[PDB]
Write a protein that binds this ligand. Structure first.
Ligand SMILES: *[C@@H]1O[C@H](CO)[C@@H](O[C@@H]2O[C@H](CO)[C@@H](O[C@@H]3O[C@H](CO[C@H]4O[C@H](CO)[C@@H](O)[C@H](O)[C@@H]4O)[C@@H](O)[C@H](O[C@H]4O[C@H](CO)[C@@H](O)[C@H](O)[C@@H]4O)[C@@H]3O)[C@H](O)[C@H]2NC(C)=O)[C@H](O)[C@H]1NC(C)=O
Ligand SMILES: *[C@@H]1O[C@H](CO)[C@@H](O[C@@H]2O[C@H](CO)[C@@H](O[C@@H]3O[C@H](CO[C@H]4O[C@H](CO)[C@@H](O)[C@H](O)[C@@H]4O)[C@@H](O)[C@H](O[C@H]4O[C@H](CO)[C@@H](O)[C@H](O)[C@@H]4O)[C@@H]3O)[C@H](O)[C@H]2NC(C)=O)[C@H](O)[C@H]1NC(C)=O
Ligand SMILES: *[C@@H]1O[C@H](CO)[C@@H](O[C@@H]2O[C@H](CO)[C@@H](O[C@@H]3O[C@H](CO[C@H]4O[C@H](CO)[C@@H](O)[C@H](O)[C@@H]4O)[C@@H](O)[C@H](O[C@H]4O[C@H](CO)[C@@H](O)[C@H](O)[C@@H]4O)[C@@H]3O)[C@H](O)[C@H]2NC(C)=O)[C@H](O)[C@H]1NC(C)=O
Ligand SMILES: *[C@@H]1O[C@H](CO)[C@@H](O[C@@H]2O[C@H](CO)[C@@H](O[C@@H]3O[C@H](CO[C@H]4O[C@H](CO)[C@@H](O)[C@H](O)[C@@H]4O)[C@@H](O)[C@H](O[C@H]4O[C@H](CO)[C@@H](O)[C@H](O)[C@@H]4O)[C@@H]3O)[C@H](O)[C@H]2NC(C)=O)[C@H](O)[C@H]1NC(C)=O
Ligand SMILES: *[C@@H]1O[C@H](CO)[C@@H](O[C@@H]2O[C@H](CO)[C@@H](O[C@@H]3O[C@H](CO[C@H]4O[C@H](CO)[C@@H](O)[C@H](O)[C@@H]4O)[C@@H](O)[C@H](O[C@H]4O[C@H](CO)[C@@H](O)[C@H](O)[C@@H]4O)[C@@H]3O)[C@H](O)[C@H]2NC(C)=O)[C@H](O)[C@H]1NC(C)=O
Ligand SMILES: *[C@@H]1O[C@H](CO)[C@@H](O[C@@H]2O[C@H](CO)[C@@H](O[C@@H]3O[C@H](CO[C@H]4O[C@H](CO)[C@@H](O)[C@H](O)[C@@H]4O)[C@@H](O)[C@H](O[C@H]4O[C@H](CO)[C@@H](O)[C@H](O)[C@@H]4O)[C@@H]3O)[C@H](O)[C@H]2NC(C)=O)[C@H](O)[C@H]1NC(C)=O
Ligand SMILES: *[C@@H]1O[C@H](CO)[C@@H](O[C@@H]2O[C@H](CO)[C@@H](O[C@@H]3O[C@H](CO)[C@@H](O)[C@H](O)[C@@H]3O)[C@H](O)[C@H]2NC(C)=O)[C@H](O)[C@H]1NC(C)=O
Ligand SMILES: *[C@@H]1O[C@H](CO)[C@@H](O[C@@H]2O[C@H](CO)[C@@H](O[C@@H]3O[C@H](CO)[C@@H](O)[C@H](O)[C@@H]3O)[C@H](O)[C@H]2NC(C)=O)[C@H](O)[C@H]1NC(C)=O
Ligand SMILES: *[C@@H]1O[C@H](CO)[C@@H](O[C@@H]2O[C@H](CO)[C@@H](O[C@@H]3O[C@H](CO)[C@@H](O)[C@H](O)[C@@H]3O)[C@H](O)[C@H]2NC(C)=O)[C@H](O)[C@H]1NC(C)=O
Lengths: 100, 143, 195, 99, 142, 194, 143, 101, 194
């Protein structure tokens, strides 16, 4: 599963519709308490991603690129609960960054 | 490259199949699914994602009546936002095992994508994508 | 509407044999259309397997012929060439492919056993060139619903041969073994009897 | 999820004086499960002396952690036990590049 | 800020009892409430403080069912308590899952919980993430 | 003591109507004290949203006035602030007192501990007449009246046998009441006569 | 030194006692196990490894009849390859808690090993060894 | 637990008995990735030939049962029961003990 | 069967005392062979816990003696160790043999059936006389001789009709037994006479 890095400076990338309507987890002062939180229903916030410099178009093509390797990865694991690849990518990123 | 600062900088959206102009009609979407016995079901977690134009709430039953889709895990919920919800219903008389996709697309649920279909609740087709963005870049792209 | 049609078109004209088919061990059958629709439950004697079981009864009739004189007489010779068969099976022209004429993709069967059955409650025309009705075959139905029964009625119209006794003996000795065959039929799922 | 790093007169880098706790026990055949102490006998009692004002700044970190860890637990979808030991290890390596 | 091996980091649980926060059986049920719409969550920890006051509260609805979550086999009782308080109460109208107002966590056997688990001993406190090697540990532990 | 206090309401001058109402569909109700103690269970009609409806209807008994003759006559001037002998008068027939959730968050310290079992915030009657709490509750084992399932409502009505001027106001007062109970629309509580 | 490129380059092979000249005969292969209360059961995942000469399908029951061994999680499956599947049926009246190994060896199952033994299905004794190989060195030796 | 680097010479250089070693392994055709056209759960195992040409199997068996000394201690401490994959931990401990300054 | 086989023993040769020991609440017990085999079910009175209390019961039966006059009262001098017809006599009425588990840890290779029908590792009676497995198992099914449900205990005692020295001893042997059977406290065992 390839992972690009969209960073500004030049809106360049590293390693299709323009209407990208998404939902996201939201990111006075008492909200961090779970009793005074927003709930899981209201946690979702509306958003809109613009494709100003082929950002959506380079990401929709990436979708089926990652379907190849990710299916093989889930085949090997004997654990059928929810698998967090969040640490997997971070650990792999550190291992492949160190060169020479 | 080396733009990782802290763990939840990485994001995982599942872009739906409507982008490639793949027919999401209640007639052709069932053509990309099939059955197989002998493979394990697996789950994968994703952070955020696109809301689908059309979503499906399909409860396939054998001629006996039991739902061929698996019992959902407790961390599996309904899909957040859907413009259209299609309640496609029907039966499969010969197939067995667990429901699987053909093209390779994952079935998207509430922040957890799956390789199988779960019992009688809203999902959508898609593939999850990994990338690394910080709050400065994400602020100017979110809206 | 119960005995009116049977006494005017297939009354005292052809000497036919009527037998009833029962399926005790088979469970209940339901159907829901591929487009979002109503659950229409069917009876015990129909599902996806016993359909083939009643499909093999007639094909195992012409192959075995009674040893009468030096000629071979089958069901084709005793009838009035395609013959008159009244059952659920004539809706499929008494052929294996039509009974399993599945239409659909790998995930849904859009139309498996209602292209010919529920469509006219691929044409469902009978193999003998006559009109067909969903009420002549399904017995045990409730109220006006014809497709909500629990038994299948199969009858074989055979000519009386009152004016020609040469073909009467051909139509007289074939089922002498068959009436002995039905009580001695090896059948672990389908049960047949008289009335 | 800020974490101080104790070192060495203790040098610290991100009230009740007494601090008595329990801890996981730190012998030939004892490492075999059949020759183990058990669930009840594993805990060892001990005391922490508030030597270089070390207890007092440890307890004021308590409310600072609850601000951040509630938000972390809200995002995650798994109801099972969540082990933060790996995340602190990865975050430490990820943020080490600055210095 | 040094770290050599994964088992160096500890998650200590410091209790509200030593913070002169009222742990009396009359002033301790004022910091808890209920809500419908939030999911229960758990967090493990390595070691914890001894508890002056512990509670074994089993709160039931007027029908009798306990509003507290069913404890997993993972979660066990708090190891050592100076005093165990068996308070019993009932919610007339409250519903959902038990939560905490100040932000503190219900502490159990090496796994802290955001929510409350039925009929079994807990103490209130937070989790402190902190790093100690072996040499500093014996210099501090007893 | 038993028959000592009952002699003042069996007199010929008082014609008292007795009705017993219960909640059959309600389930068991248990209560346990704040510190600790025995889980003392309540009756099926002793719960929330089952005593409110009784409290709602008893206020509407005098709230709704029937157009009799050409003048408006209230029950207060013909009854002998009418005296109410029930369990509802222990809460002064008020919505706030009957749901006086004194306490805090998480669980409430007391809801009926200071109202019903306190005599076992004011607990005595506010109309100046003390009443024994075992009269309102019937169908209970031994002496323990706090473990019953029946509610009794007592409305003292003067006979007015020697006073025909005020007789007509009270004679027809209960004629609509007996018509009301058979025509009362309710899903939970049933009115019974004796 | 030691090199490591990607995470899956580590593999944990469970080497069994059968090839170590440890007596696997059923007369004296049941003296390396015992029982104890108060010890939590734990599982451990491994990638590949050797399969032993012999394998065991042992159904230990109390005098009442209940199996003394733990119910297997859905994660646990039968051990794939076994030259001989030895079937021993043992019964004891004085068990306590869960089954444990005397030598500290682990009970090997389908890609997940355990410190305890599970209910009525094939395992083997062994110990897990972890090591690091890349593509070319493993392919040279695995062949 | 300890783990050696089972790497090449740059022979078979090592890092920190029976010669025959029969193993079963998971493989490391155009439509193989999709699980509908995959092998399954019982047919992804491949046999193996291993040469003990540099005193190879003998030490790994001796090393396997030195591992049970410390792996059993780790499993006792942790409170989770279903599955505890060390594949992440060995990777982090590799990085923790490498960037020593 | 026992009536027909013991019919010939009813003559003037020996006098036997028959008692029945039955296990009311003990669950069904099965034994499976160590290598492999069919699970042979035993009778209720054949579980580690029970039968030992019978061994204790037998010890208490034999050790207690009733003193008569100034003479010495011993069981050994009057019994023909002694003539015992039971299951425990295969174990020589000893606690070590009854719990002689010839097995390693985890499961025992054999603990109980290795002295009952193993080599019939002692396999002979403690007295040396003839003994059969169907003489103690009462309720067996045909050719099993071990598929019964109740235990029978038999004490063959000399008639002592011509021996005046032991006549009083034989008279007083069962005087303490007839009231020891109904005062011994046991909630999982029943003793019946004939
Ligand atoms: C990455 O993005 C690309 C581009 O959008 C997607 O590529 C598609 O890949 C699928 C793979 O399944 C292709 O679908 C297959 O195409 C083959 C041809 O079938 C018919 O296709 C043409 C046009 O539709 C017809 O004219 C002609 O009759 C062909 O027969 C076949 O291999 C497949 O059909 C098989 O299954 C059906 C049963 O349903 C039966 O016909 C037979 O069994 C047959 O073998 C299938 O249709 C698809 O064409 C590709 N699209 C494009 C635009 O190239 C990827 O899917 C995407 N990856 C993801 C989402 O994971
Ligand atoms: C002999 O008699 C009749 C037919 O002649 C049969 O009765 C039919 O049986 C079904 C099933 O009981 C009747 O009920 C229908 O079931 C469906 C329920 O909808 C939900 O179904 C499941 C519930 O878990 C969900 O997964 C799903 O998403 C749906 O939400 C619906 O199909 C029907 O509801 C609609 O029915 C009609 C639609 O035309 C409308 O008028 C209704 O208002 C409603 O919207 C329905 O409830 C069904 O009605 C019966 N069919 C008829 C009358 O034609 C008998 O069972 C049969 N006897 C035997 C022994 O076979
Ligand atoms: C870490 O930091 C936290 C804060 O982030 C400290 O913990 C406590 O935090 C709570 C929550 O903010 C504080 O308690 C609150 O204080 C207020 C008191 O208001 C009262 O004002 C007067 C009396 O002074 C009266 O009118 C009346 O009593 C008022 O209540 C209020 O905001 C809150 O009162 C609550 O009362 C009830 C609760 O049942 C509710 O109905 C009310 O709506 C309201 O929420 C509340 O009591 C508290 O002050 C903080 N403590 C301290 C010492 O500052 C930690 O102390 C700090 N340190 C550590 C080591 O953890
Ligand atoms: C009419 O009245 C009868 C008789 O009172 C009611 O039946 C019983 O009512 C009594 C109270 O009068 C109840 O007895 C109390 O029950 C509690 C025990 O229940 C605990 O059980 C276990 C504990 O192991 C746990 O599930 C849980 O903790 C339960 O709470 C205790 O509160 C009481 O015993 C303890 O308290 C006393 C207080 O003085 C002390 O001596 C000790 O601490 C003691 O341990 C007490 O035993 C009893 O539960 C009621 N029984 C039933 C079956 O409900 C009738 O219910 C009532 N009739 C109707 C129709 O409602
Ligand atoms: C990796 O692998 C090697 C090879 O397996 C290990 O070496 C073995 O270590 C185990 C550790 O338990 C040894 O097992 C023990 O050895 C002793 C044998 O002494 C007995 O010698 C004879 C045997 O007939 C008798 O005089 C008498 O029984 C002696 O006791 C004993 O300490 C143990 O006996 C136990 O046997 C069983 C349990 O095994 C129990 O029922 C008994 O009660 C008794 O306690 C036990 O057998 C084994 O002998 C070692 N083998 C060899 C070849 O050396 C290494 O330890 C390990 N390498 C590492 C960690 O680096
Ligand atoms: C009075 O009469 C007889 C004795 O004379 C007793 O009958 C015995 O009862 C058992 C059942 O309780 C008979 O059946 C045996 O049960 C076992 C079943 O096999 C499996 O059982 C469970 C399944 O979950 C597994 O745990 C276990 O490992 C086995 O896989 C087996 O022990 C036997 O199977 C064998 O049967 C014959 C035996 O020769 C072989 O041909 C087979 O291949 C197989 O190995 C068996 O089925 C048992 O046979 C009976 N014993 C006999 C006849 O000697 C009565 O119960 C008893 N009555 C009372 C009240 O005690
Ligand atoms: C997708 O389709 C499924 C199947 O029809 C829907 O599930 C249905 O959800 C409703 C509530 O929305 C359930 O009704 C409730 O069920 C239980 C008792 O069964 C109880 O909580 C309530 O009294 C209420 O009746 C209904 O049972 C359930 N149906 C099935 C078959 O499980 C689902 O809601 C659909 N999703 C969407 C977004 O519409
Ligand atoms: C805190 O209070 C709770 C609730 O009363 C206590 O938990 C309960 O403890 C009792 C007594 O041990 C358990 O009863 C059990 O019942 C059967 C026999 O009836 C048997 O399994 C045991 O012998 C035991 O008696 C009960 O199950 C248990 N309930 C739960 C939900 O765990 C708890 O013990 C109290 N804590 C302390 C520290 O005292
Ligand atoms: C190891 O021994 C165990 C028993 O200790 C064997 O498990 C047995 O597996 C068979 C199938 O291979 C099970 O039969 C099935 O049972 C149910 C109920 O009839 C049903 O799913 C099927 O119709 C079939 O009959 C059997 O119940 C099961 N035994 C137990 C006690 O669970 C296992 O197969 C052995 N492993 C081998 C031989 O490799």
């Amino acid at each position: 599963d390839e992972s690009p890095s969209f960073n500004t400076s030049s809106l360049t990338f590293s390693y299709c519709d323009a209407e990208l309507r998404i939902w996201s987890v939201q990111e006075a002062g008492l909200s961090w308490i779970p009793f005074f939180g927003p709930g899981i229903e209201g946690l979702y916030t509306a958003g809109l991603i613009k494709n100003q410099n082929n950002l959506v178009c380079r990401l929709r093509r990436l979708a089926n690129q990652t379907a190849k390797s990710l299916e093989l990865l889930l085949r090997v694991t004997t654990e059928e609960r929810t698998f967090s690849l969040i640490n997997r990518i971070a650990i792999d990123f550190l291992l492949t960054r160190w060169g020479g | 490259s080396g733009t990782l600062q802290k763990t939840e900088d990485v994001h995982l959206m599942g872009f739906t199949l409507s982008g490639q102009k793949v027919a999401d009609s209640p007639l052709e979407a069932s053509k990309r699914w099939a059955f197989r016995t002998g493979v394990p079901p697996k789950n994968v977690e994703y952070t955020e994602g696109e809301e689908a134009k059309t979503c499906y709430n399909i409860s396939v039953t054998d001629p006996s009546g039991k739902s061929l889709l698996l019992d959902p895990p407790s961390n599996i919920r309904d899909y957040p936002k859907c413009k259209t919800v299609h309640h496609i219903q029907g039966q499969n008389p010969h197939a067995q095992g667990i429901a699987l996709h053909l093209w390779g697309a994952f079935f998207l649920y509430d922040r957890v994508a799956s390789t199988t279909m779960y019992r009688g609740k809203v999902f959508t087709e898609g593939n999850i994508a990994a990338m690394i963005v910080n709050k400065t870049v994400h602020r100017m792209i979110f809206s | 509407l119960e005995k009116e049609y049977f006494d005017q078109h297939f009354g005292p004209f052809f000497r036919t044999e009527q037998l009833i088919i029962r399926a005790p061990l088979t469970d209940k059958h339901i159907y829901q259309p591929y487009p979002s629709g109503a659950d229409v439950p069917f009876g015990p004697p129909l599902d996806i397997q016993i359909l083939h079981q009643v499909l093999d009864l007639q094909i195992a009739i012409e192959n075995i012929t009674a040893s009468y004189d030096n000629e071979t007489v089958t069901l084709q010779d005793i009838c009035l060439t395609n013959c008159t068969i009244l059952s659920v099976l004539n809706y499929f022209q008494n052929s294996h492919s039509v009974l399993d004429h599945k239409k659909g993709d790998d995930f849904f069967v859009y139309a498996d056993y209602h292209t010919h059955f529920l469509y006219c409650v691929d044409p469902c025309l009978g193999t003998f060139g006559g009109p067909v009705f969903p009420w002549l075959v399904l017995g045990g139905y409730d109220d006006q619903n014809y497709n909500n029964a629990t038994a299948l009625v199969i009858t074989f119209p055979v000519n009386n041969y009152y004016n020609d006794t040469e073909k009467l003996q051909r139509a007289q000795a074939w089922e002498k073994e068959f009436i002995n065959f039905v009580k001695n039929y090896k059948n672990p799922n389908l049960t047949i009897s008289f009335t």
